[PDB]
Amino acid sequence: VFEVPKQNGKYETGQLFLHSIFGYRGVVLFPWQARLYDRDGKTHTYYQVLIDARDYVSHEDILPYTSTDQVPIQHELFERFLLYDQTKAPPFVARETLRAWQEKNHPWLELSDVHRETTENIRVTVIPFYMGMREAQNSHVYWWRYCIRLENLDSDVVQLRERHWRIFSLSGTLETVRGRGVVGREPVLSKEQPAFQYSSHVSLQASSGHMWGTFRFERPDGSHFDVRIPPFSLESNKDE
Ligand SMILES: [Pt+2]
Ligand SMILES: [Pt+2]
């Protein structure tokens, strides 16, 4: 049974839902507040989500539904994070392991800002996450994992062909990567399947710096245009 989307209120831990785009069966583990930067101070609520039969989602992407059976798979993770069927709006309540995992994630999610920008009817959404070491062997180097979502609001078909990353670090050294496709594939965005979301890692020295980029898109009429990636930062340990 599909519920209605909440217009003023977060989703309780344990709500079953489908993703607004590429609808997969997921369950929210806990929400976290993020800062939006729509280039086109404002906060926004995102959710840690455990997916099945196939991540961080937004509030507007959650399409909730209720069920009876233990629908979500990955039972080796739900038996550890959640408790069995009970009596509450979400019938899965959170176990103490999920509360400890939430307390462990809360500091690292503070270094995560969501950035958006719409260029020629192409909306890109980038959000970095931190996984690193204060000291890598021989020399201190830590990395990040940035999630990027491409969306085509226009009805015109278009395909991503080239990427043009430009990574600047704290030391003053800046890297520039012009590559073919994204994750070794060139996604197409049309009326059917208009969105594509991926994630990749970026290693860096000095444990600071910002990253901007450019995605090259091609239309069936031969025209190629560059969409901008909103410059997102890569910070560590309580600093903005
Ligand atoms: Pt990572
Ligand atoms: Pt992601």
Question: Both tokens of residue 81?
Answer: 């994070």
Q: Which residues of 179-198 are buried (b: 16+ CB within 10 A; e: fewer)?
A: eeebeeeebbbeeeebbbbe
Residue 103 φ/ψ, nearest 5 degrees: -65, -30
Ligand nearest to the CA of 147: 2
Tell me the residue length of the chain. Answer: 240
Ligand nearest to the CA of 148: 2
For residue 32, report the distance from its CA to the centre of ligand 2, in Å.
Answer: 15
For residue 142, report the distance from its CA to the centre of ligand 1, in Å.
Answer: 10
- Resolution at which this structure was determined, Å: 3.4
C-beta separation of 90 from 12 below 8 A: yes
Q: For residue 130, give every residue at least 6 positions away whose Cβ sits within 8 Å of its Cβ, in sequence order, or none.
A: 108, 111, 112, 142, 144, 145, 234, 235, 236
CA 128, CA 48: separation in Å to the nearest integer? Answer: 14
Q: For residue 32, give every residue at least 6 positions away whose Cβ sits within 8 Å of its Cβ, in sequence order, or none.
A: 45, 46, 47, 48, 105, 106, 109
Question: Both tokens of residue 214?
Answer: 């450019």
Residue with tokens 């979500």: 72
Structure obtained using? X-ray
C-beta separation of 45 from 125 below 8 A: no
For residue 57, report the distance from its CA to the centre of ligand 2, in Å.
Answer: 8
Residue 80 φ/ψ, nearest 5 degrees: -95, -35
Burial class (CB in 10 A: 0-12, 13-18, 19+), 41: exposed
